[PDB]
């Protein structure tokens with residue numbers, strides 16, 4: 001690393017780890033195209049395994065970025081349109097509240113109050129139809145954004161129906177493989193388990209459990225290297241040889257709705273750069289990030305704007321992550337930790353690092 005990068009990383013990450021008691025963390029900095037890696041602490045406290053560049057972290061809701069891109073790749077292949085009604089892909093959704101709710105609404109949390117999580121009692125396919133058939137909206141479609149795994153989760157499950165593939169198999173073949181993300185998994189294969197960090201919640205070692213629509217909303221595990229390569233791929237999508245993937249990435253950073261000073265893409269969220277850091281830092285706090293807000297349609301959607309801060313927070317019960325980049329500045333960051341610590345602490349550290357490098 002250039003000395004600039006070590007100094008701001010160490011001066012920023014050391015106090016964060018101490019403040020938050022994070023057992024293991026990996027950071028990548030993307031700077032003038034190339035990634036620079038830092039690791040601290042333990043993947044596995046008990047067995048004294050260090051965090052390395054090969055350690056797998058659970059990405060949590062950062063998985064929604066892969067989901068948004070794969071959905072974008074399906075649009076670009078001609079298989080779906082964001083203007084299609086939900087019912088085109090799930091006809092059994094016959095309850096009348098589903099009228100007028102499109103793929104766009106699902107992908108962007110604007111369907112009218114679909115909930116944060118799919119409840120744990122929803123295990124089977126028929127439980128899932130049931131859950132969506134019996135849900136009643138809080139609002140008309142396309143008036144309020146409420147951040148929701150049940151919403152983007154359903155988008156991803158529907159968006160792969162036309163391809164004929166499982167969502168897993170579509171993600172593998174259409175996103176992971178072409179980008180050479182070869183240590184990124186929805187299901188960790190048994191031979192790779194030795195690299196799988198434990199998550200820590202109130203001291204207990206934990207992994208994420210199976211759940212309805214887990215792959216679509218929070219199901220990806222990856223390494224700091226592969227996540228660096230995911231950021232580079234989203235920073236510079238024209239370098240990607242597969243046409244539909246290249247367009248898919250650009251569709252996921254298109255601006256569909258605005259609330260306050262933020263815009264909703266497909267899994268990614270964006271703000272104009274130069275950004276006010278107060279708004280990203282405070283905006284990431286759950287009190288705000290999880291609240292319903294009114295949305296203004298961007299008519300028509302703005303194509304990926306280079307001069308943007310593009311980002312996503314994610315957590316599971318035992319992990320906490322964050323990815324942010326700025327395409328105009330050829331700059332990005334990935335922060336993976338095996339503890340779920342508050343979002344504003346993540347964003348503030350990323351902001352400290354990146355504004356220092358621009």
Ligand SMILES: *C(=O)[C@@H](NC(=O)/C(=N\OC)c1csc(N)n1)[C@@H]1N=C(C(=O)O)C(=C)CS1
Pocket residue numbers: 059060061062116117149208209211217218286290313314315316317318340343
């Ligand atoms: C995304 O990260 C998603 N998070 C979750 O679904 C979980 N935990 O979040 C704190 C989760 C999934 S499986 C498991 N054991 N835990 C949504 N994101 C957030 C977030 O802070 O980004 C949440 C508020 C919970 S829901």
